[PDB]
């Protein structure tokens, strides 16, 4: 079974690019990160910063999570992100995503020792 | 019982200002919109655009909702928003919120006739 921290890395980290460079970014990344296996994951955000910078958010601003838990943290700075969301044309096994690049604060839930991101809550 | 559309208006519309003008905006708005009754609502976004502009999003870009439903729409333009989230010092009945102002696309779920916003899904 994948650990929570490793699942967060696979689902939400893309440090290899500064930003989504085209409309096809999401189609490619959702497939390669194995997020379209038996169904299309409807919504997923990738963060274009170093793993260290994203891990560091766990000791930044403590804020509530949408679900009411209190282990969420909001990055002090904006970060480059890409939101991927299914379009109307999306139909498994032919998943189709809209790519929206932005620079926003991220909010992650953190857990464990080491205390690291385990969920992506939202961006602001 | 409050209708879904009216609840969205109360929870998510603040057309009276162009933007959050201070750190105390959220404390004030979460209280006045009755979002701190028996408990502090942990997270809540207000949109600083006209009601018409926000309603119009329901005929803009159709995208998946985080929960996998297909009745979500992403605004073509960015909009002025304020995210309100509880801080560590927040303890009912003394709710306390961090105010984060941003300009982002909004994503809403739409329903009904007229087809209007009934949930705030996320911003990008
Ligand atoms: Cl996500
Ligand atoms: Cl919200």
UniProtKB/Swiss-Prot annotation, chains A, B:
Q: What species is given as this protein's source? A: Bos taurus (Bovine)
Q: Does the keyword Membrane apply?
A: no
Q: What does this protein do?
A: Endonuclease that catalyzes the cleavage of RNA on the 3' side of pyrimidine nucleotides. Acts on single-stranded and double-stranded RNA.
Q: Which residue ranges run through the membrane?
A: none
Q: Outcome of residue 12 to A?
A: Loss of activity
Instruction: Write the span of the intact protein that is present.
Output: 27 to 150 of 150
Assembly behavior: Interacts with and forms tight 1:1 complexes with RNH1. Dimerization of two such complexes may occur. Interaction with RNH1 inhibits this protein. Monomer.
Record's subcellular location? Secreted
What EC number(s) has UniProt assigned to this enzyme?
4.6.1.18
Enzymatic class: lyase
GO molecular-function terms, A-Z? lyase activity; nucleic acid binding; ribonuclease A activity; RNA nuclease activity
Primary location group = secreted
Q: Which reaction does it catalyse?
A: an [RNA] containing cytidine + H2O = an [RNA]-3'-cytidine-3'-phosphate + a 5'-hydroxy-ribonucleotide-3'-[RNA]; an [RNA] containing uridine + H2O = an [RNA]-3'-uridine-3'-phosphate + a 5'-hydroxy-ribonucleotide-3'-[RNA]
- Gene name for this UniProt entry: RNASE1
Q: Which UniProt keywords apply?
A: Disulfide bond, Endonuclease, Glycation, Glycoprotein, Hydrolase, Lyase, Nuclease, Secreted, Signal
Q: Does the keyword Hydrolase apply?
A: yes
Q: Which residues are noted as glycosylation sites?
A: 1, 7, 34, 37, 41
Consequence the record notes for mutating residue 119 to A = Loss of activity
- Name by which UniProt lists this protein: Ribonuclease pancreatic
Q: Which GO terms describe its cellular component?
A: extracellular region
For substrate, which residues are the binding ones?
7, 10, 41-45, 66, 85
Q: Where is the active site?
A: 12, 119
- A Gene Ontology biological process term: defense response to Gram-positive bacterium
The entry sums up its family as follows: Belongs to the pancreatic ribonuclease family.
Q: List the disulfide bonds.
A: 26-84, 40-95, 58-110, 65-72
Top-rank lineage group of the source organism: Eukaryota
Tissue expression: Pancreas.
């Amino acid at each position: 079974k994948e650990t929570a921290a490793a699942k967060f890395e696979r689902q939400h980290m893309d440090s290899s690019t500064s930003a989504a460079s085209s409309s096809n970014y999401c189609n490619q990344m959702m497939k390669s990160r194995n997020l379209t296996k038996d169904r299309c994951k409807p919504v997923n955000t990738f963060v274009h910063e170093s793993l260290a910078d994203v891990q560091a958010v766990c000791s930044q601003k403590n804020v509530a999570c949408k679900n009411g838990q209190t282990n969420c943290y909001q990055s002090y700075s904006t970060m480059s992100i890409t939101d991927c969301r299914e379009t109307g044309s999306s139909k498994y096994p032919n998943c189709a995503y809209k790519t929206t690049q932005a620079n926003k604060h991220i909010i992650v839930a953190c857990e464990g020792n080491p205390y690291v991101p385990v969920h992506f809550d939202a961006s602001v």
